[PDB]
Amino acid sequence: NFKELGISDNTVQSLESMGFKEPTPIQKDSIPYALQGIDILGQAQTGTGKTGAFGIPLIEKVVGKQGVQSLILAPTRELAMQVAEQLREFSRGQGVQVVTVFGGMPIERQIKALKKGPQIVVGTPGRVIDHLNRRTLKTDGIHTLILDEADEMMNMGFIDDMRFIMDKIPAVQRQTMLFSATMPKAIQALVQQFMKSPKIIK
Numbered sequence: 001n002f003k004e005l006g007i008s009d010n011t012v013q014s015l016e017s018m019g020f021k022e023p024t025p026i027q028k029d030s031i032p033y034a035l036q037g038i039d040i041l042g043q044a045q046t047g048t049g050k051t052g053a054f055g056i057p058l059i060e061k062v063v064g065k066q067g068v069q070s071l072i073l074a075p076t077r078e079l080a081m082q083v084a085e086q087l088r089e090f091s092r093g094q095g096v097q098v099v100t101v102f103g104g105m106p107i108e109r110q111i112k113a114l115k116k117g118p119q120i121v122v123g124t125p126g127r128v129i130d131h132l133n134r135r136t137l138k139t140d141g142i143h144t145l146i147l148d149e150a151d152e153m154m155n156m157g158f159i160d161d162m163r164f165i166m167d168k169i170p171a172v173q174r175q176t177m178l179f180s181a182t183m184p185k186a187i188q189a190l191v192q193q194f195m196k197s198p199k200i201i202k
């Protein structure tokens with residue numbers, strides 16, 4: 001169960017309340033490794049429980065810390081919103097802020113949210129780069145970087161954006177996770193250059 005995987009009591013209560021009675025296979029396989037700080041390469045698709053697989057240990061990692069601690073990249077506004085909603089449910093009542101940054105709104109609204117130093121930022125690669133270029137997303141405290149559906153981000157033209165983000169965020173103290181159903185050459189290059197010999201989970 002989630003307790004036996006190493007998850008704290010308050011987070012487990014929140015998971016139970018959202019209907020997570022038992023971990024999924026990918027959560028059982030990933031979570032103990034994610035908690036150990038190891039880089040993870042997940043070959044998984046929606047339906048597996050992959051949001052919980054990265055999100056649950058991320059909550060355990062950032063709770064009680066200050067400033068932007070983690071960045072999750074998603075291919076679409078819709079997936080970003082869904083991931084952010086789940087993370088807010090996981091972390092219910094523990095003082096964790098989650099901020100979403102994607103296109104379609106003026107960037108001023110997001111800048112204001114980022115000034116408060118949310119522990120978790122979830123965004124699309126293009127919008128994230130806008131904040132990096134404006135210095136409104138500080139990378140100095142970012143200790144976890146998650147690429148959700150890396151193949152889909154590449155299908156939408158974001159490979160250079162992903163490369164840039166992975167190069168710009170300091171790597172030595174960073175834990176990186178990459179989830180993707182397919183791994184074409186461009187994605188394999190990201191793993192080889194920007195990750196630390198990740199554990200492969202299938």
Ligand SMILES: Nc1ncnc2c1ncn2[C@@H]1O[C@H](COP(=O)(O)O)[C@@H](O)[C@H]1O
Pocket residue numbers: 019020021022023024027045046047048049050051052
């Ligand atoms: N351990 C679990 N028990 C029941 N439902 C879950 C569990 N983990 C994830 N889910 C749900 O599984 C669906 C697929 O999640 P994902 O693969 O993260 O897109 C989502 O609706 C989640 O809420």
